């Protein structure tokens, strides 16, 4: 058969390229049931509706999109964002968990509204002046995955709560007091992820308790993997929420006022200049040949 | 002061840090192949016999944001999976999923007939009003 | 120091700074070097000549996109 449109060849060609082959190619080098029956009944009703048919032919139909979002929510798609941004590799050394509790967080700004914290969202450090609102007996931890200034694997806590009764977070132990974001300048977008871990039994995390207030980076540094490994028996993550933050004026305030340190500033480091090595005695070297080699020409 | 201690060079591990900054590498090869590969993300719109689907796909071929009328939430409020209005809704829904995913920029390369289709044009109108950009920023060298 | 230097006229200073911003240090000084000859005076002479050329020669979608991405973020920031 011959493709009657370019797309037919393109779609097959695109699919063909994606699939691996024995010959070398670029990619290898560089790379419940009851509910459905109820759903089917709605389809018949929706299709039968004469008004809906008229709207379709009149191209005037509309949708309550807000309902779609709630019904769509979500576990499988929520995992994609966390994995896509590299939370799992940095936070659990590659362990991947499907979030089952629809965790949602927002940074409270003033009193009129609270800034959402989507998956992959961008929130300025200024807007994060105060701690955010997070919505059985579980725990909850805050992380600065790439906000660390000295060690790559290490990361800093904003605030860590343990033994959170049911859902109410006010009763959780404030092991780590809240700290505003402090992303270094020149490093682009820093990803901060919010993790919710199922707590099988209430356990005193004396090891993770930190002085309140604490303004030392030497004690804020920690590792999620080893911390989770120590509690991995009773800890199974289920909630995810992470945003990106750039440098901002508030960051200077955080680094100086309470962190009490000079603001970190970074940029791509260029290689040392390349210098040709001329010969001390240019034996049998004319000026015309040296003229091309030297700057003058 | 202990806090002052900082490494000479930063350690940023965010995959999209370079992409968001614009310094991430875009495929500049494939000079003998069409179309250009100088896009971090692409909008893939698949119109099946009974369903219309739109996706946002990275160069690697893995969809990050997927919007399909096959999804239960959209269809229940959507009369017919194949329709001009459905293209608008999936674009707005795809945008909302893009809003959920944090992806603001994308590269759309419609085919000659696909571009001429009014439904796809309205779907593009759905994306622009939702703020999703059909054109990505240029790479930084 | 390009800006502080008063011998260069102010209009030239701004044009030089914009044209050769890459050669300005964080302190604001204009830095140029020559290591292309075995003669120290030649390197000095080359450096001086380049300065003379700069004085004589001296004598947007990006912003919109930054607004668009910021506008997109605000619309993207909708989970209330």
From Swiss-Prot, chain A:
Q: Which cysteines are joined by disulfide bonds?
A: none
Q: Which domain of life is it from?
A: Eukaryota
Sorted keywords for this record are: Coiled coil, Mitochondrion, Ribonucleoprotein, Ribosomal protein, Transit peptide
A GO CC annotation recorded here is: mitochondrial inner membrane
- Which GO biological process entries does UniProt record here? mitochondrial translation
Matches recorded under Pfam families: PBP
Give its localization.
Mitochondrion
Q: Locate the coiled-coil region(s) and give their ranges.
A: 33-56
Assigned protein family = Belongs to the phosphatidylethanolamine-binding protein family. Mitochondrion-specific ribosomal protein mL38 subfamily.
Subunit arrangement? Answer: Component of the mitochondrial ribosome large subunit (39S) which comprises a 16S rRNA and about 50 distinct proteins.
This protein is called: Large ribosomal subunit protein mL38
- Organism, scientific name: Mus musculus
This chain is encoded by the gene named: Mrpl38
From Swiss-Prot, chain B:
Keyword Transferase present in the record's keywords: the answer is: no
> What GO cellular-component annotations does this UniProt entry give?
mitochondrial inner membrane; mitochondrial large ribosomal subunit; mitochondrion
UniProt entry tagged with the keyword Zinc-finger: no
Q: Which UniProt keywords apply?
A: Chaperone, Mitochondrion, Ribonucleoprotein, Ribosomal protein, RNA-binding, Transit peptide, Transport
Q: Where in the cell is it found?
A: Mitochondrion
Q: Name one GO molecular function term.
A: 5S rRNA binding
* Biological process (GO), any one: mitochondrial translation
Record's family?
A: Belongs to the universal ribosomal protein uL18 family.
Q: How does it assemble?
A: Component of the mitochondrial ribosome large subunit (39S) which comprises a 16S rRNA and about 50 distinct proteins.
Q: What does this protein do?
A: Together with thiosulfate sulfurtransferase (TST), acts as a mitochondrial import factor for the cytosolic 5S rRNA. The precursor form shows RNA chaperone activity; is able to fold the 5S rRNA into an import-competent conformation that is recognized by rhodanese (TST). Both the cytoplasmic and mitochondrial forms are able to bind to the helix IV-loop D in the gamma domain of the 5S rRNA.
Name of the protein described by the UniProt record: Large ribosomal subunit protein uL18m
| Whole sequence portion shown | 39 to 179 of 180
Swiss-Prot record, chain C:
Whole-protein coverage range: 104 to 192 of 206
Per UniProt, subcellular location reads as: Mitochondrion
User: Per its UniProt entry, which superkingdom is the organism in?
Assistant: Eukaryota
User: This chain belongs to which protein, by name?
Assistant: Large ribosomal subunit protein mL62
The entry describes its oligomerization and partners as:
Component of the mitochondrial ribosome large subunit (39S) which comprises a 16S rRNA and about 50 distinct proteins.
PTM note says: Methylation of glutamine in the GGQ triplet by HEMK1.
Its taxonomic path starts at: Eukaryota, Metazoa, Chordata, Craniata, Vertebrata
Q: What does this protein do?
A: Essential peptidyl-tRNA hydrolase component of the mitochondrial large ribosomal subunit. Acts as a codon-independent translation release factor that has lost all stop codon specificity and directs the termination of translation in mitochondrion, possibly in case of abortive elongation. May be involved in the hydrolysis of peptidyl-tRNAs that have been prematurely terminated and thus in the recycling of stalled mitochondrial ribosomes.
What is the similarity comment for this entry? Belongs to the prokaryotic/mitochondrial release factor family. Mitochondrion-specific ribosomal protein mL62 subfamily.
**What is the organism field in this record?**
Mus musculus
């Amino acid at each position: 058969e011959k493709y009657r449109s370019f797309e037919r060849y393109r779609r097959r060609a695109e699919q063909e390229a994606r699939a691996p082959h024995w010959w070398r190619t670029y990619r290898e080098h560089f790379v419940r049931t009851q509910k459905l029956l109820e759903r089917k009944h709605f389809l018949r009703e929706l299709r039968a509706n004469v008004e809906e048919e008229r709207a379709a032919r009149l191209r005037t139909a509309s949708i309550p999109l807000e309902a779609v979002r709630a019904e769509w929510e979500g576990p499988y798609h929520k995992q994609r964002l966390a994995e896509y941004y590299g939370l799992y590799r940095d936070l659990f050394h590659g362990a991947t968990f499907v979030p089952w509790v629809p965790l949602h967080v927002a940074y409270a700004v003033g009193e009129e509204d609270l800034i959402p914290v989507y998956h992959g969202n961008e929130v300025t450090p200024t807007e994060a002046s105060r701690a955010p609102e997070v919505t059985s007996l579980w725990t909850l931890l805050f992380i600065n995955l790439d906000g660390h200034l000295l060690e790559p694997d290490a990361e800093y806590v904003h605030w860590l709560l343990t033994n959170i009764p049911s859902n109410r977070v006010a009763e959780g132990q404030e092991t780590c007091p809240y700290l505003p974001p402090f992303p270094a300048r020149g490093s682009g977008f820093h990803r901060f992820a919010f993790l919710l871990f199922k707590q099988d039994k209430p356990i005193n995390f004396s090891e993770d308790t930190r002085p309140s207030p604490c303004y030392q980076l030497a004690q804020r540094t920690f590792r999620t993997f080893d911390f989770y490994k120590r509690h991995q028996e009773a800890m199974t993550p289920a909630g995810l929420a992470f945003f990106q933050c750039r440098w901002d004026d508030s960051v200077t305030h955080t680094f100086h006022q309470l962190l009490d340190m000079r603001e970190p500033v970074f940029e791509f480091v260029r290689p040392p200049p390349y210098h040709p090595k001329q010969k001390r005695f240019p034996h049998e070297q004319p000026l015309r040949y040296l003229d091309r080699y030297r700057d003058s020409h | 002061k202990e806090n002052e201690a900082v490494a000479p060079e930063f350690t940023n591990r965010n995959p999209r840090n370079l992409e968001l900054l614009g310094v991430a590498r875009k495929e500049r090869g494939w000079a003998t192949v069409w179309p250009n590969r100088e896009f971090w993300h692409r909008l893939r719109v698949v119109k099946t016999q009974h369903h219309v689907e739109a996706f946002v796909e990275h160069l690697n071929g893995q969809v990050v944001v997927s919007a399909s009328t096959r999804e239960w939430a959209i269809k229940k409020h959507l009369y017919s999976t194949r329709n001009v209005v459905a293209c608008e809704s999936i674009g707005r829904v795809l945008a909302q999923r893009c809003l959920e995913a944090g992806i603001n920029f994308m590269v759309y390369q419609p085919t000659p007939w696909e571009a001429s289709s009014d439904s796809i044009k309205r779907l593009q109108n759905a994306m622009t009003e939702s703020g999703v950009m059909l054109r990505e920023p240029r790479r930084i060298y | 120091h390009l800006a502080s230097a008063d011998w260069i006229e102010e209009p030239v200073r701004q044009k030089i700074a914009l044209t050769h911003k890459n050669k300005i240090n964080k302190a604001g000084e204009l830095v140029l070097t020559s290591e292309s000859s075995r003669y120290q005076f030649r390197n000095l002479a080359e450096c001086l000549q380049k300065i003379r050329d700069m004085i004589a020669e001296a004598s947007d979608a990006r912003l919109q996109r930054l607004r668009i991405e910021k506008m997109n973020r605000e619309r993207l920031r909708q989970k209330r």
